Amino acid sequence: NLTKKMKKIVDAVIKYKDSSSGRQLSEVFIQLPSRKELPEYYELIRKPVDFKKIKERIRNHKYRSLNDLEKDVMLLCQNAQTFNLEGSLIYEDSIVLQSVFTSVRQKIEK
Numbered sequence: 001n002l003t004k005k006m007k008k009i010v011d012a013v014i015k016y017k018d019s020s021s022g023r024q025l026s027e028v029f030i031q032l033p034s035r036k037e038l039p040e041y042y043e044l045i046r047k048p049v050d051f052k053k054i055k056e057r058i059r060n061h062k063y064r065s066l067n068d069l070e071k072d073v074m075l076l077c078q079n080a081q082t083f084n085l086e087g088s089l090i091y092e093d094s095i096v097l098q099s100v101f102t103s104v105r106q107k108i109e110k
């Protein structure tokens, strides 16, 4: 019920495609490179999180409110903006996914 509405919102943010390109913005954010693939990420970033983890925290009842879900999504995006350079595509995708989240959330809340 809360779990299922959290699921719906995340599935739709994951599925979201850029208008002109049709590119699925979430794609790089689904799953972080492993600690051995990219140790720099884990040195720089304090609370690593990817969409796979967010889906696990949902399934495991770790979010008490839609606000707690939003907080972890906004953190994934913040972490992307810290690791990647301003002016990079990945950085900007994380920026855009902030408003995709809030839009999807609103629609679903209604």
Ligand SMILES: O=C(/C=C/N1C[C@H]2C[C@@H]1CN2c1ccccn1)c1ccccc1O
Pocket (backbone or CB within 6 Å): 028, 029, 030, 031, 032, 033, 037, 038, 049, 050, 051, 076, 079, 080, 081, 083, 084, 090
């Ligand atoms: O910043 C994120 C990922 C950046 N990576 C993905 C590609 C582009 C950049 C460097 N990449 C590498 C680097 C080494 C191995 C695999 N991918 C990121 C991914 C999931 C959740 C949050 C994130 O910040």
Ligand SMILES: [Zn+2]
Pocket (backbone or CB within 6 Å): 061
């Ligand atoms: Zn519960």
